[PDB]
Amino acid sequence: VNEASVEHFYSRAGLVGVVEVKDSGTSLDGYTVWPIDVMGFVQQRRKLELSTYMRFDAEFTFVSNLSNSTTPGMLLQYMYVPPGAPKPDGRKSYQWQTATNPSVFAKLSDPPPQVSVPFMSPATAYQWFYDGYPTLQYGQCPNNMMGHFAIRTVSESTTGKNVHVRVYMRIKHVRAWVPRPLRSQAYMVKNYPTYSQTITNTATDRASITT
Amino acid sequence: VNEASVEHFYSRAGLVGVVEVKDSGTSLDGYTVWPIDVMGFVQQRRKLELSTYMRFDAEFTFVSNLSNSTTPGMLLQYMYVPPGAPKPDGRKSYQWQTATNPSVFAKLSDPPPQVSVPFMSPATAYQWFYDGYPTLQYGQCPNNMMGHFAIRTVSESTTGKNVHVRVYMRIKHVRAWVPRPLRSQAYMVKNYPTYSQTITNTATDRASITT
Amino acid sequence: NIVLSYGEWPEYRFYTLSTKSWKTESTGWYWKFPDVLNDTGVFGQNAQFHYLYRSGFCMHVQCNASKFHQGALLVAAIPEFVIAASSPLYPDFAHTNPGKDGQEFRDPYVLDAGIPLSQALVFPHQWINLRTNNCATIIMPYVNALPFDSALNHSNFGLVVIPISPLKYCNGATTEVPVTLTIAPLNSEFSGL
Amino acid sequence: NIVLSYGEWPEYRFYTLSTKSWKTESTGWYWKFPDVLNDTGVFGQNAQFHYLYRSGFCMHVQCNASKFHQGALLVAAIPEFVIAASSPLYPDFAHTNPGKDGQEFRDPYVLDAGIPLSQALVFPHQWINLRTNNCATIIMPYVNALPFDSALNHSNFGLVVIPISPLKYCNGATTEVPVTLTIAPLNSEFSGL
Amino acid sequence: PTELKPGTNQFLTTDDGTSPPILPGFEPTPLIHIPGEFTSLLDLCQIETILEVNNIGVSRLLIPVRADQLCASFQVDPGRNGPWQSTMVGQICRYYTQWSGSLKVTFMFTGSFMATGKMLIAYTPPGSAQPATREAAMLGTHIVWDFGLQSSVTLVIPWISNTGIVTIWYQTNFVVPPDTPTEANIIALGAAQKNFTLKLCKDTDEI
Amino acid sequence: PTELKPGTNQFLTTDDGTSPPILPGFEPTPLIHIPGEFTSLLDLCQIETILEVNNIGVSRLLIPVRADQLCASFQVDPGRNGPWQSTMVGQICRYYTQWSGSLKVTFMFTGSFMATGKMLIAYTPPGSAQPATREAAMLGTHIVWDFGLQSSVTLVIPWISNTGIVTIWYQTNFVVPPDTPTEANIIALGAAQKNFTLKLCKDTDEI
Amino acid sequence: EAAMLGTHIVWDFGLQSSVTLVIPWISNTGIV
């Protein structure tokens, strides 16, 4: 009864993204910018597309460690660049100091940080299916973007160790609108519906209709 | 009075299993899957068989350390694969990312993690004695299985250290049904009643019945 | 009888589009509209001049065939209906805004959305079974995330007519069966002239 | 007097099985049943055809012997009674479903369950002491984890009769003592024909 | 100030809790009424959707009828595979582990208005093997459905917990006047009943 | 916010606490009535179970009677060893350290209906040595039990805290008509009383 | 066993020395 519900069907934390700062090797950057995308994995893309419209709050958790699993104390900054704000160029860029970008300072020895992101869209609800041109652009609604998370180790110059991060998002206070079928065809491109020319059948074949 | 009770007779935490991830040696796996079994030790098998039917909640605690007892900070994942879900193939398998398998991220420097597992059976209560064929299969009821715990260190490739885990389960909110004798004969095979052909006597011998 | 989409009345004249011939081999059609009426009528001039509008619709599909013809049609109204481009990528503008004369499905089975047609019954729908009934009627309230939007850019919903069971007739009968559509705007509003 | 197992009445005709001869050397018997009546009677055809059933039983053991015979029997009803296979492994199907003619214990001392016979008095039981009384009666309610189950696959309980104290008689007396069993199903139900 | 820390301390269980908001004072856009809200996944099951009984394209949804034979048969289990794999009820059952309840099936005869005939629609319990003759199929649960009188009929499968068989038998023959097409079709529509329920959770193997 | 951490902090004591559920929203299968529930281990003691007085198989449960001698004797302590090791009361006393209360013993004469005789059943306090003659055994606690009149008798051992001796003496002789078997048996049934109690805990050495 | 399923009475000597079986209606033949 209550175990199948739109509130309970979109519930538990799941892995949205996997990022790496990687300043050790030929890549000396020491920072990364990760756009917030709920559809990055095809199985969570398919569940969110059971609804045309959704309105929810987000819960982000950052599980971070080095490559050998050891978590020595070292200081990281998790910033949040809301939609419409410029993204850092480098580790020393002045765009890490902006007071309107909320940031979290937490060591790798601490429990994983977590924060809540309110509903960001100008429209009443996120719409995963948009028909028409907003202004290649067919079906592309700019209202959905939730912003970015920029992550860097706080250091003067070039620490030689790579940091692996895993982001866990949890949908909260979810409301859904008009129902929609579940996709039969395999996804191809990230943003669009386009499907391969070889149509695969929904139901599996048998010898004859008798049995 | 209250010190001998079915609630108080099955009570305190006890050692259900001892597992090792062992990625250091010729075994490079770095993960292990442990099926939840309350009867793994013969003395807790004998106490649970004082009842035919039981219904209870579980409490699992994971005490983990390296081989030399030192517990350096390193990140482990304890997942839980409920009955009916596929088990990880390897350390990098995609079955660690499934959102419906609850998992716990806790370092070796932390207090031991603990979680609670609800009553999982389709039947009203677990039945430790089943008569008849469900479909070798004699007395084998599939309804009892509680699932698995898959454990791995979170790392990119091959950390060279072995981790020893000890699992402590605690029976909660226990209800029991029709009483049964306590086994006299020694156990042989894990699942079945089968007993050795040499019958050992319950009461110890004396010279004569006079004294 | 009347089908009321999503149990809402569209609270806040009849346009007869040209007839389609449904031959035994035809694969179906979709009109995808606020759009069908943009280029026709007095409703079509309002849609050009005003910068925002809110409107519901009432649409009526009717099929003229004898008692010796047989077949069936599924008539559905699908909100935010988005067309996909089958690989060997983007759909052409003729497909994404077919006009008043509609477009004919390339793949009726996936509805060119990648979603299966078996489950298309989750949307507001009717059946035309040539023995049972010749007509289907659907009232569609205004569904959008915003209270107002643009008529030229955004298409609120499509209307889709798939011949699920092919048309059969004995020799001598009329080869094609006319299928005609009638749209009456309900409770339309405009702003920003 | 009557023994009511576990204080429950089985709320929601008489079948006389063939007679067993209890000789001085016999080791006892077990009928293990929903099963005894599967192959006999009108109850046996219901158990084949319906896919689920719920039933309680009433069973009556009676022993005909003179005043010069002596001995004793323990009569118990044991739920979920599971047979074990003694090493020099699985019990054969003849042992796990003995039928209407019952099976004879290999080891009466452990009841072939590995559990001791001394403590078998924890189950619903009676004594037949040939001087005191010739009969024992037990009413068994339906015990299961589920409200319904299958008659062919699952056996709810066994019935076990062990000659604890061997039979003795002087020369000239009848060598064997007949032991007969009578089963009346109480409050049986069926579904899924 | 006297607190102490038990064994459950300081780990991520990936299950519910509370967290501080990242932007305080941010006021999100207010709600408006949108139609078509659905609060449950048990009302998406109850709506009948075509089930694919023929194993070819859109022809896979239809069983043909031509002029005491078995027309078609299919099993009643939504979860596993086969026809129910194209229904909505069978696609959401792949997200859960265990479903229990009663089902529903509907047939529509698509042939001509002038055509007359009769069919036999039988159901078999989960334990039994399917009937090998229509006379054996008649003694069980069945409905005798006459085309000319009624164009659609409904068979309700009784309780089933997580499998039965539905067999369609020609009775009599498919009778047509002159100048009427001799072949027709039937579409089958499956749906959950009101008492259907879903349990545990799982990750679909469809994607 | 002012809290501080005392010396009891952050260890596993393997004793009671609370923990978060691993699956929220999971609804387990509801309860139904099952008969035969037992909430205590003191009511499993009160039920009489055969105790093994003869040291051979099922013959170990019986004391023979044949045609002023001591038939048999056994000590009354459930915990240690011997006859009480086969009772239910003596198997649960191996899980605890200390038991205190009163016991009960019952005898059943299995011989023929035509046989007549008499016995003497005596009990000795824990400090005394057992009687060497039936006349010394008579002066203490005893019951004189006549077969032909009564087939079963009960001896209640008074309070004992965590040991007495029960001795059975032939009085008179075992008298039988012609054509009646000359040997008989007696089974002994031990059980706890209503005031029996169990203390501490331990791990059985039986397994 | 075939005779048991029909009409029968099980008569114990030691308890009772005489028993009665009533044949139901017959019009002008059964077997005992």
Residue numbers in the entry:
A (entry chain A), B (entry chain A): 75 to 209, 219 to 294
C (entry chain B), D (entry chain B): 30 to 41, 62 to 137, 146 to 250
E (entry chain C), F (entry chain C): 3 to 57, 62 to 73, 78 to 172, 189 to 233
G (entry chain C): 145 to 172, 189 to 192
Sentences from the paper on this structure:
Although highly effective vaccines exist for EV71, no vaccine is available for the global public health threats imposed by CVA6, which underscores the critical need for developing an effective vaccine. Here, we demonstrate the isolation of two stable CVA6 particles with excellent natural antigenicity: one empty (CVA6 procapsid) and the other infectious (CVA6 A-particle). The capsid structures of CVA6 procapsid and A-particle at near atomic (~3 Å) resolution both closely resemble those of the uncoating intermediates of other enteroviruses. The cryoEM structures of the CVA6 procapsid, A-particle, and A-particle-1D5 immune-complex we report here reveal atomic resolution details about molecular determinants in CVA6 related to virus neutralization, cell binding, and RNA release.
The top band exhibited a λ260/λ280 absorbance ratio of 0.71, and the particles in that band sedimented with a coefficient of 84S, had a capsid protein composition consistent with the presence of VP0, VP1, and VP3 in sodium dodecyl supfate–polyacrylamide gel electrophoresis (SDS–PAGE) gel electrophoresis (lane 2), and showed an absence of packaged genome as verified by negative stain electron microscopy. These characteristics are all consistent with this band being composed of purified procasids. A total of 10,749 procapsid and 7152 A-particle images were extracted and subjected to three-dimensional (3D) reconstruction, respectively, yielding final density maps at estimated resolutions of 3.3 and 3.1 Å. The density maps of the procapsid and A-particle reveal essentially identical (0.96 correlation coefficient), pseudo T = 3 icosahedral capsid structures, which explains why the two particles share similar antigenicity. The obvious difference between two density maps is the density of genomic RNA, which is present in A-particles but absent in procapsids. Atomic models of their biological protomers (VP0 + VP1 + VP3 for the procapsid and VP1 + VP2 + VP3 for the A-particle) were built manually and subsequently refined by Phenix. The structural similarity between the two atomic models was deemed quite high as judged by their superposition and confirmed by an r.m.s.d. value of 0.4 Å between the two models. Though the procapsid was shown by SDS–PAGE to contain VP0 (containing the sequences of VP2 and VP4), only the VP0 sequence corresponding to VP2 is well resolved in the density map and hence successfully modeled, indicating the one corresponding to VP4 is flexible as that in previously reported EV71 procapsid. The first 70 residues at the N-terminus of VP1 are missing in both models; The AB loop of VP2 in the A-particle contains a flexible segment of 10 a.a., but 20 a.a. in the procapsid; In VP3, one small segment (a.a.74–77) is missing in the procapsid, whereas the corresponding segment in the A-particle is intact.
